[PDB]
Design an enzyme around this catalytic site. Structure first.
Site, mmCIF file in Angstrom:
data_model
loop_
_atom_site.group_PDB
_atom_site.id
_atom_site.type_symbol
_atom_site.label_atom_id
_atom_site.label_comp_id
_atom_site.label_asym_id
_atom_site.label_seq_id
_atom_site.Cartn_x
_atom_site.Cartn_y
_atom_site.Cartn_z
ATOM 1 N N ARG A 1 -81.086 -31.048 33.226
ATOM 2 C CA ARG A 1 -80.564 -31.846 32.093
ATOM 3 C C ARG A 1 -81.628 -32.318 31.110
ATOM 4 O O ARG A 1 -81.299 -32.999 30.147
ATOM 5 C CB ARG A 1 -79.738 -33.048 32.559
ATOM 6 C CG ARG A 1 -78.571 -32.686 33.474
ATOM 7 C CD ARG A 1 -77.885 -33.978 33.919
ATOM 8 N NE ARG A 1 -77.125 -33.778 35.159
ATOM 9 C CZ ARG A 1 -75.854 -33.468 35.247
ATOM 10 N NH1 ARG A 1 -75.093 -33.367 34.211
ATOM 11 N NH2 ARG A 1 -75.304 -33.274 36.406
HETATM 12 N N1 LIG Z 1 -73.254 -26.703 25.120
HETATM 13 C C1 LIG Z 1 -74.231 -26.463 25.985
HETATM 14 N N2 LIG Z 1 -75.205 -25.591 25.643
HETATM 15 C C2 LIG Z 1 -76.183 -25.353 26.521
HETATM 16 N N3 LIG Z 1 -76.368 -25.852 27.735
HETATM 17 C C3 LIG Z 1 -75.388 -26.712 28.049
HETATM 18 C C4 LIG Z 1 -74.316 -27.061 27.254
HETATM 19 N N4 LIG Z 1 -73.505 -27.974 27.908
HETATM 20 C C5 LIG Z 1 -74.087 -28.152 29.064
HETATM 21 N N5 LIG Z 1 -75.239 -27.426 29.212
HETATM 22 C C6 LIG Z 1 -76.119 -27.405 30.369
HETATM 23 O O1 LIG Z 1 -75.693 -28.382 31.283
HETATM 24 C C7 LIG Z 1 -76.347 -29.634 30.968
HETATM 25 C C8 LIG Z 1 -75.354 -30.589 30.375
HETATM 26 O O2 LIG Z 1 -74.518 -31.116 31.403
HETATM 27 P P1 LIG Z 1 -73.844 -32.512 31.046
HETATM 28 O O3 LIG Z 1 -73.331 -32.470 29.654
HETATM 29 O O4 LIG Z 1 -74.762 -33.615 31.437
HETATM 30 O O5 LIG Z 1 -72.629 -32.432 32.076
HETATM 31 P P2 LIG Z 1 -71.645 -33.468 32.778
HETATM 32 O O6 LIG Z 1 -71.629 -34.664 31.894
HETATM 33 O O7 LIG Z 1 -70.324 -32.778 32.857
HETATM 34 O O8 LIG Z 1 -72.230 -33.751 34.116
HETATM 35 C C9 LIG Z 1 -77.513 -29.291 30.046
HETATM 36 O O9 LIG Z 1 -78.683 -29.894 30.564
HETATM 37 C C10 LIG Z 1 -77.563 -27.764 30.049
HETATM 38 O O10 LIG Z 1 -78.474 -27.288 31.005
HETATM 39 MG MG LIG Z 2 -72.878 -37.123 32.221
#
Ligand SMILES: Nc1ncnc2c1ncn2[C@@H]1O[C@H](COP(=O)(O)OP(=O)(O)O)[C@@H](O)[C@H]1O
Ligand SMILES: [Mg+2]
Ligand SMILES: Nc1ncnc2c1ncn2[C@@H]1O[C@H](COP(=O)(O)OP(=O)(O)OP(=O)(O)O)[C@@H](O)[C@H]1O
Ligand SMILES: Nc1ncnc2c1ncn2[C@@H]1O[C@H](COP(=O)(O)OP(=O)(O)O)[C@@H](O)[C@H]1O
Ligand SMILES: [Mg+2]
Lengths: 456, 81, 506, 88, 456, 147
Positions: free
Chosen positions: F83
């Site tokens: 992340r």
């Molecule tokens: N639109 C996107 N483009 C590229 N990578 C993404 C994207 N959305 C998620 N990711 C990947 O996953 C991560 C984002 O997850 P996150 O938004 O924190 O998920 P959640 O909130 O559902 O746990 C980023 O660090 C990346 O590695």
């Molecule tokens: Mg989150």
């Protein structure tokens, strides 16, 4: 003496009695000034008893007086119960006045002892060809009935009710365990119109009644059947659905607070089934034979309810939607339906070989039908085409016009004997009727009637 | 073919004009009812407050005559009730 | 202009005398359950009166205390507050005055259209008419859908379950079934349990936009309201529907989520500490839905003459129910779905795979069933539905051969295209209910072979144009079929001549 | 010919939809006119009842007590009516 | 009066008060000496109240005096809250000193009445192809971002905030509920560096905080949004994870003396959710547009918490782990996502037909996937081979490079308009791009960039 | 676990200078965490695994099929994610490793789809060939780190 209501929690009611007047387990209690009956389930101690209301608890309050009756729920028995509709307590739910009873029996008793059992296996001649050939019933046996709606279940029950009364001098009892009020009214009129109502006693526990009513209705109907057996008769006990008897036990067990077992069923599952099923037997006076409709949860035959019930079944009759489309109204599947009595050491070598011969030819024809469909009728050998012709004649000769079905078939009813049933199928297997058209073997009864129907 | 097309179009436009009229009467009825019920709502809302203030006055009014005359009459009446 | 002084004149004619009351004191308050000390004469189901015009119901009459549930908000109640017996069970207003109004689970108006003028009240919990007072179901209830009215017919006094996953048209099918009753004579009741307030308002706005609101009673118990009100709402709506049935008339009731009523009853039970069973539901959850659904029935002329004391004669009354249940990922083996599937007269199963494949009504006709069957159909629909059943059954058997239609045998290839054209005919639009005559044109055209030269992609525009043609040149024939749904050789020849003439010029 | 027949039917379907949507805007236009005027009419009437209700509130308070206790309250009602009207 | 702590167990504390001075349900209490607030949840009886700490209990002891405040938690509301970071109690958690409040509201409130609801269908453009096509949002509507762990809930919400909040003329409330403290810091510096912090109120309750804090943070943020709605303004409300509100209730439910329900959840799951969700609405005074991220335990959408949440929302956007595992983002499932705006009367017939056309192709590809795996692709019809090629192009044309995701991909972000989205999907369905390879449609933007990518 | 794992963080220069009473100025401080979790037969739906995956700033999934197939590092690139992304890399590795994980995630899918199909286009063949090379490159030995 009398006690007082101390606690009300849904259908569960606690009553306090003097130390010298505590009612027994399964004893029936009456609330003063209200038409409510309580069955005692447990003795908590200190004079207090836990009971289950056999009715609604709306409007009841703590401190009401309750009277002990001295015995378990006692219901009317004998001839007066025929052609009548009753509740779990034996009250006449039909608006036809009081039952002309001469005696009353308690619904709880032990199964007949080891010494009271009959000296062998005696088939019950239903007079229906497909059942008497492929699904032979033993007197005192339990039959599981499987299939969906609109496949002839009601007509088949009415024919059995007619034949036990007219051809064997017996009687019938129908236990509506968790009965739908619409279907209960429709069944009562269909039996009045078919003239079989005076040959059966109707006991209904409707779906909207509390769990205790749905659990005890099977014992009320069984108590009426026990009386006729003692008279010197062979009796039919029809149970509308044995799965609903199991579920009512699960509901009551949860209300009483007991710890649940595997898949959430009551810990007493096998004992509650055994207490009901062990009373249905062939004694040295008469024999209660039972036809029970069976429901399978989630299509799983390994589920505790199907598993426990199958342990007490002597025969399995399957009604098929496909067979009905063909036009065989009885609709019993000769390949899926089975009986434990289909053994040469019980029915003799002749009946066994004839029944297994019919099943072999019908199996081969089901395989050949896929060949004829995928590759064509010209692809088969001469011997296979001869088999197809005998199989078709056998399949139609499994049909029969019932006396309760004259309104649908437009023809008079037939009662075929086991001797006539065996002789007819044995002849078609050997080829004695290979010259007759298959239609001549449709809706005729005995084999001599096929000969004439072909002559014209 | 062309004459039946003109006939199909004629029914479509005739029914569209009656549909347009139908929605016009339904829409005006909604607004008419909303204004009529708003008026009765204001009358009943103020009526509740007016009653509450009249009851508050009654409490004070009662207290003076209630102590001398009503205390003996209330106690004796309650024994009869 | 002046009204406050006259309404006060009546207030000076109200009882000021002492009354013997049976009372108690609040001991504890938590999660919507107030435990009371006293009330020695309170009855199971009686309503308790608390300070502030708040009311409750007694459900746990234990030896040392009363467990009561609040029929409103309990966060204002407190230890030491007074509690009083009322001597009454819960009752709701009933009669024609409820038609076109939105009310809460207790019958109070929430629409803002003013007070209700009901001339009578009735008990929410009542027993259903016994076996001997009923009459067989043989009158139709048209839903306006070709797939339901032709293959899964619903009769007056029947109980038909709408079962399926989330977001696949369960609500749309039941609301359209209510909209189709605006001219039929059947009064309608819609009960909203655990829904959000803005969703209930979109259904009422659609009942008003379609002219169906004036024939409907709307009972609401939204997601922020007490679990006791959500548990009682189906019984309140049923009681309002039973008025018309007991007086010789016909009514239709929709319970938008019986699964949410079960969830509300589970909350109250686990908080009263009642022994739990499968999926944590109380031991009487089957009895909850069964006691409700067995009231939906058809009663005989003798019951209506007995109840009306002779006033209404020769008429049989009824209450038809359309309960709705949500399944999780198609699991029909769950505890609550299993109970209701066993209580009802039939089931309409909606499927997510069919809904995503463009089959908008989503009715899986292969597993859906009505135990009443042909007795709930008019003569014309009963004659044209038989072949529709055979063609769809043949299509379910021969659906893998579409990719090899060239290699098929001619007979089978003829059956395959018929199956595909009848399957495309079942597709319909929302808020577009069809009449018996309009449904009959479409079913007749497919069952008599008038679709064999229409590309499977043009079957719909052919249906729409055919109905529009008959509405202009055959208005007298459509009116004749709509009288009773009758069928004879003159109607058969009349429809045939019109379809042949339609194809020959349109 | 059939291409022109289809154009006649399709343009009529489009024209029908326009006939209905213009009527929706016309209906809303008059609905808002009626709503605005009616709110002003009620607002003026509401000021007239506001002063009238103040005076009658004191009279309604004495009429409840005036039935039974009214014999004794004939004397108290004079003092209590003038004091309560001035106190509000 | 004054109370004494009598029982501390984890986050739950019992306080005993004089039987004539028992504080009300939801009333706030203060411990003497220690800086800790307790909210009454239950009145056990005998002057004792059960409460949950809004802080740590490591410093608490039995016998500490507790003070009754006479009211529920009162947080600051209005213009003074803009450009500030606050905790559950409304205290400032930024170094900018005190907040100049002119009023305090109680976090607990009734939901707007049935007569106060308002209906509107104004279409709100997001700039994302999948959403603008199958999940068209509406102004004043409720949106839910459903998904498991690591599929894009935060990222997608940040992109929306950027494509809507930044342009939005009105105010905004951002509530971080059970969020990572690192995400809160990155977002604060992002709003501050973007100069948009002036129109955004920030309330944070991260995972390092006591259950009581995570149980009321949502009511604090909503109370600030309700003050602005009631002023007649248009407001945006963003909630980072509303599941943490349900979970905090599960963590504390058993210590509050409540028996557990199915999947070990509080028996008050549906009411606790309804009481919060019914306040997040657009009334007749002002309009709250809200976006909530909804965590799905173990990716199972049938879990009681996610399953109870769908009925509260207007737009449901579903993120799939199987799509994310193929490197496709946004990982939106076009067959499980839905909106009340996906209706021909609201969006038009062209958009509606294009969306249904895309869904039909994707559902047909989902059932052909297994065939292709076992037998192979040459055993398909010519129509199926063409449909599989287009389904794979549509599945890649739904991916989009985002401006908030450039650190993760290295590629520049793109904003596609609704006109461009419809045109690009209508073209692929029609066949205008059956020559370009499926890799040309992966991570591009509008359909012209796929045409340029194909050449290289 | 959330009370434990939220301590692993990076603190600002202002935080360090206040705590160190001015002793340390112009310096940020940090605690990085590498928690380990064991699953039963790959089941992530268990209560504890579900909780921890929802708290960390990323995860590295190790797969048993890959470990037995010869890829000893066994990192499943499709399920694993960071992340923080490119902010946690030096400029050279940040530019050279651009979309490698999402490209490996798509290569694993393309291979199964093209397992029994007739000859495909150059785009498909080129993608499938590049994927089999990056997959073999990611293999490394224990106790042998690279600069
Ligand atoms: N639109 C996107 N483009 C590229 N990578 C993404 C994207 N959305 C998620 N990711 C990947 O996953 C991560 C984002 O997850 P996150 O938004 O924190 O998920 P959640 O909130 O559902 O746990 C980023 O660090 C990346 O590695
Ligand atoms: Mg989150
Ligand atoms: N012919 C149709 N029949 C039914 N629904 C349709 C049809 N055509 C389109 N739809 C749409 O499908 C969706 C069905 O929503 P509906 O509320 O009826 O489903 P539901 O299963 O009851 O959903 P929920 O579980 O939220 O209550 C709506 O958007 C509706 O407008
Ligand atoms: N023996 C029969 N002879 C002729 N028709 C029959 C026969 N048995 C069943 N049927 C046909 O099937 C229908 C349903 O049979 P029924 O016994 O009522 O089945 P179910 O009780 O499940 O509804 C009958 O009304 C009749 O049309
Ligand atoms: Mg719905």
């Amino acid at each position: 003496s009398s006690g007082r209501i101390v606690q009300i929690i849904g259908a569960v009611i606690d009553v306090e009695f003097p130390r010298d007047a505590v009612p027994s387990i399964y004893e029936a209690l009456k609330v003063q000034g209200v038409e409510t009956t309580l069955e005692v389930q447990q003795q908590l101690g200190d004079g207090v008893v836990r009971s289950i209301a056999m009715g609604s608890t709306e409007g009841l309050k703590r401190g009401l007086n309750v009277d002990s009756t001295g015995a378990a729920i006692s219901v009317p028995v004998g001839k007066a119960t025929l052609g009548r509709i009753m509740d779990v307590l034996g009250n006449p739910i039909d608006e036809a006045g009081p039952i002309g009873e001469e005696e009353r029996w308690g619904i709880h008793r032990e199964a007949p002892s080891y010494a009271d059992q009959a000296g062998g296996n005696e088939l019950l001649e239903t007079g229906i060809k497909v059942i008497d050939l492929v699904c032979p019933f033993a007197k005192g046996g339990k039959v599981g009935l499987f299939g969906g709606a609109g496949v002839g279940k009601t007509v088949n029950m009415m024919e059995l009710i007619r034949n036990i009364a007219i051809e064997h001098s017996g009687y019938s009892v129908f236990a509506g365990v968790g009965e739908r009020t619409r279907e209960g009214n429709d069944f009562y009129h269909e039996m009045k119109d078919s003239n079989v109502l005076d040959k059966v006693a109707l006991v209904y526990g409707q779906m909207n009644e509390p769990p205790g009513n749905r659990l005890r209705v099977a014992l009320t109907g069984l108590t009426m059947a026990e009386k006729f057996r003692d008279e010197g008769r062979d009796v039919l006990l029809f149970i509308d659905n044995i799965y609903r008897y199991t579920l009512a036990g699960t509901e009551v067990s949860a209300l009483l607070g007991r710890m649940p077992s595997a898949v959430g069923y009551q810990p007493t599952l096998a004992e509650e089934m055994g207490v009901l099923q062990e009373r249905i037997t062939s004694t040295k006076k008469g024999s209660i034979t039972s036809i029970q409709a069976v429901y399978v949860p989630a299509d799983d035959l390994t589920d505790p309810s199907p598993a426990t019930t199958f342990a007490h079944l002597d025969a399995t009759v399957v009604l098929s939607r496909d067979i009905a489309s063909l036009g065989i109204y009885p609709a019993v599947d000769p390949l899926d339906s089975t009986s434990r009595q289909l053994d040469p050491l019980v029915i003799g070598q002749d009946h066994y070989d004839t029944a297994r011969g019919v099943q072999y030819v019908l199996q081969r024809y089901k395989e050949l039908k896929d060949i004829i469909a995928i590759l064509g009728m010209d692809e088969l050998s001469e011997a296979d085409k001869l088999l197809v012709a005998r199989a078709r004649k056998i399949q139609r000769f499994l049909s029969q016009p019932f006396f309760v079905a004259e309104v649908f078939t437009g023809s008079p009813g037939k009662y075929v004997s086991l001797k006539d049933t065996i002789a007819g199928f044995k002849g078609i297997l050997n080829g004695d009727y290979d010259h007759l058209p298959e239609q001549a073997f449709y809706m005729v009864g005995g084999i001599e009637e096929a000969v004439e129907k072909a002559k014209k | 073919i062309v004459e039946q097309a003109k006939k199909r179009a004629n029914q479509i436009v005739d029914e569209a004009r009656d549909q347009a009229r139908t929605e016009g009467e339904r829409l005006k009825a909604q607004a008419q009812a909303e204004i009529e019920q708003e008026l009765n709502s204001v009358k009943d809302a103020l009526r509740a407050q007016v009653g509450a203030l009249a009851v508050t006055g009654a409490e004070k009014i009662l207290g003076a005559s209630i102590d001398a005359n009503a205390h003996e009459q209330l106690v004796s009446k309650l024994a009869a009730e | 202009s002046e009204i406050s002084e006259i309404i006060k004149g009546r207030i000076e004619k109200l009882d000021v005398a002492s009354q013997a009351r049976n009372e108690g004191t609040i001991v504890s308050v938590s999660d919507g359950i107030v435990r009371i000390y006293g009330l020695a004469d309170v009855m199971y189901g009686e309503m308790i009166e608390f300070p502030g015009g708040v009311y409750g119901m007694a459900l746990n009459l234990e030896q040392d205390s009363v467990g009561a549930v609040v029929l409103g908000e309990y966060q204002g109640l407190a230890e030491g507050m007074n509690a009083k017996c009322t001597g009454r069970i819960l009752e709701v207003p009933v009669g024609p005055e409820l038609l076109g109004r939105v009310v809460d689970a207790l019958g109070n108006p929430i629409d803002g259209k003013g007070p209700i003028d009901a001339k009578a009240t009735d008990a929410v919990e009542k027993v259903a008419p016994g076996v001997i007072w009923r009459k067989s179901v043989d009158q139709p209830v048209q839903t306006g859908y070709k797939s339901v009215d032709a293959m899964i017919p619903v009769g007056r006094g029947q109980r038909e379950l709408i079962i399926g996953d989330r977001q696949i048209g369960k609500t749309a099918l039941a609301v359209d079934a209510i909209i189709n009753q605006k001219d039929s004579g059947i009064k309608c009741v819609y009960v909203a349990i655990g829904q959000k307030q803005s969703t209930i308002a979109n259904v009422v706005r659609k009942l008003e936009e379609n002219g169906a609101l004036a024939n409907t009673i709307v009972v609401a118990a939204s997601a922020s309201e007490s679990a006791a009100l959500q548990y009682l709402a189906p019984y309140s709506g049923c009681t309002m529907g039973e008025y018309f049935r007991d007086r010789g008339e016909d009514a239709l009731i929709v319970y938008d989520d019986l699964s949410k009523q079960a969830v509300a009853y589970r909350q109250i039970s686990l908080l009263l500490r009642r022994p739990p069973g499968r999926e944590a539901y109380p031991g009487d959850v089957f009895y909850l839905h069964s006691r409700l659904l067995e009231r939906a029935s058809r009663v005989s002329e003798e019951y209506v003459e007995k109840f009306t004391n002779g006033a209404v004669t020769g008429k049989t009354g009824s209450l038809t129910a359309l309960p709705i249940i949500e399944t999780q990922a198609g699991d029909v083996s769950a505890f609550v779905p299993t109970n209701v599937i066993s209580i009802t007269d039939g089931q309409i199963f909606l499927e997510s795979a069919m809904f995503n494949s463009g089959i908008r009504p989503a009715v899986n006709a292969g597993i859906s069933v009505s135990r009443v069957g042909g007795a709930a159909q008019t003569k014309i629909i009963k004659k044209l539905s038989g072949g529709i059943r055979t063609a769809l059954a043949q299509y379910r058997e021969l659906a893998a051969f579409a990719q090899f239609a060239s290699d098929l045998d001619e007979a089978t290839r003829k059956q395959l295209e018929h199956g595909q054209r009848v399957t495309e005919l079942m597709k319909q639009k929302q808020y577009a209910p069809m009449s018996i005559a309009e449904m009959s044109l479409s079913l007749y055209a497919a069952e008599r072979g008038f679709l064999q030269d229409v590309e499977i992609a043009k079957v719909g525009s052919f249906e729409q144009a055919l109905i529009s043609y008959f509405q202009r040149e055959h208005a007298a024939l459509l009116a004749k079929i709509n009288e009773k749904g009758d069928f004879n050789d003159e109607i058969d020849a009349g429809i045939k001549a019109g379809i042949e003439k339609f194809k020959a010029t349109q």
